[PDB]
Amino acid sequence: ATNHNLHITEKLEVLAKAYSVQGDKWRALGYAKAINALKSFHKPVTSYQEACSIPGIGKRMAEKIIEILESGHLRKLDHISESVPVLELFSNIWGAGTKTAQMWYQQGFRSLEDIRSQASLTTQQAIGLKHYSDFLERMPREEATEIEQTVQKAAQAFNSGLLCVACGSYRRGKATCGDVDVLITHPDGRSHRGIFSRLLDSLRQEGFLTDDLVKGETKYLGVCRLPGPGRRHRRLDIIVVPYSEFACALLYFTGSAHFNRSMRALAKTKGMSLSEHALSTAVPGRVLPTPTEKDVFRLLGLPYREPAERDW
DNA sequence: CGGCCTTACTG
DNA sequence: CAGTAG
DNA sequence: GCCG
Ligand SMILES: Nc1nc2c(ncn2[C@H]2C[C@H](O)[C@@H](COP(=O)(O)CP(=O)(O)OP(=O)(O)O)O2)c(=O)[nH]1
Numbered sequence: 259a260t261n262h263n264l265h266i267t268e269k270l271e272v273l274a275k276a277y278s279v280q281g282d283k284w285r286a287l288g289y290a291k292a293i294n295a296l297k298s299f300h301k302p303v304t305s306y307q308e309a310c311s312i313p314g315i316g317k318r319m320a321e322k323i324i325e326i327l328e329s330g331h332l333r334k335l336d337h338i339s340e341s342v343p344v345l346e347l348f349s350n351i352w353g354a355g356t357k358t359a360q361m362w363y364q365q366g367f368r369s370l371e372d373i374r375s376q377a378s379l380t381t382q383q384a385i386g387l388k389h390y391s392d393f394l395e396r397m398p399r400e401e402a403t404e405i406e407q408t409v410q411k412a413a414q415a416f417n418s419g420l421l422c423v424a425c426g427s428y429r430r431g432k433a434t435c436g437d438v439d440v441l442i443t444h445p446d447g448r449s450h451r452g453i454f455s456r457l458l459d460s461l462r463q464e465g466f467l468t469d470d471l472v473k474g475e476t477k478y479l480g481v482c483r484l485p486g487p488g489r490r491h492r493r494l495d496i497i498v499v500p501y502s503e504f505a506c507a508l509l510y511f512t513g514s515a516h517f518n519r520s521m522r523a524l525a526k527t528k529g530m531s532l533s534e535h536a537l538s539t540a541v542p543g544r545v546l547p548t549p550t551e552k553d554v555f556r557l558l559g560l561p562y563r564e565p566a567e568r569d570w
Numbered sequence: 571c572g573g574c575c576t577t578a579c580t581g
Numbered sequence: 582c583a584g585t586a587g
Numbered sequence: 588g589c590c591g
Pocket residue numbers: 425426427428434435436437438439495510511512513514515518519575576587
């Protein structure tokens with residue numbers, strides 16, 4: 259639905275993002291969750307006592323939601339270090355995180371021009387810098403579809419049986435997608451092998467793939483651009499998995515990230531372990547049979563949720 | 571007090 | 582391994 | 588940050 263407390267979240271997001279880019283990950287996680295809670299809430303919040311009651315919101319956070327409701331402002335925001343805007347600028351480079359951002363800042367850099375001419379850049383960071391603007395824009399769902407079909411087409415040319423599905427935000431039904439996450443497998447349980455590498459060659463020779471960021475056993479993180487004019491470069495992620503891990507692979511890749519974390523966390527409390535490979539029992543333990551996503555929720559004693567309902 | 575998901579690539 | 586990322 |  260819609261957020262009934264944007265006047266609150268909007269202010270907290272600024273602070274959460276500040277801590278994030280500065281390296282205070284755990285505190286930033288607290289705000290991130292506090293924020294997620296406020297958003298998905300039946301109606302607007304009105305009181306302190308009303309705030310604390312909400313899971314994910316404690317005394318310190320409740321206080322802040324108050325200052326906002328009463329002072330209409332968050333004094334804390336008035337003291338965010340002047341290095342934050344630059345740290346955010348830097349970490350928006352794919353391949354560069356909080357540590358690299360702080361280092362560059364310590365060395366005197368303040369702008370991308372500074373980074374381009376003087377900073378030391380890993381191969382990935384150079385690619386991220388080159389597509390800085392493109393990677394900041396979420397693409398129209400329709401374009402996400404075009405990309406999925408492109409990979410599926412190139413893949414099925416090797417084996418018409420190969421199953422290709424765009425997961426991530428796409429499968430969750432979002433209007434726009436930051437990238438395209440394509441899962442590839444095969445019902446025969448063995449044909450998925452021996453393609454990955456050749457598939458990337460096809461897409462590469464075809465001019466579709468323009469830059470590679472990470473190439474591994476079953477995962478690929480790269481960059482693509484549809485043919486024709488008016489096209490931006492888009493991030494593309496592909497994972498090839500054995501059909502026996504389909505349900506878990508699909509569940510993982512569909513996300514959301516926070517949804518995955520919660521689900522894995524729950525599994526953990528029940529003496530189980532959840533990954534993109536399988537759902538098991540604490541130690542490794544035994545692999546529980548999971549033919550479908552629903553089997554995962556069931557085994558975890560959770561009511562099934564549609565992909566569109568997995569925001570967190 | 572102390573975890574806060576879990577796995578994988580890069581160098 | 583640390584850093585970054587899905 | 589929050590929570591067990
Ligand atoms: N367990 C886990 N799963 C994750 C994590 N990050 C991502 N995933 C899973 C869940 C996530 O759905 C999937 C794709 O990750 P992206 O493509 O990076 C983010 P998307 O949701 O696709 O939305 P977009 O911003 O692209 O429009 O990997 C993480 O930290 N942990």
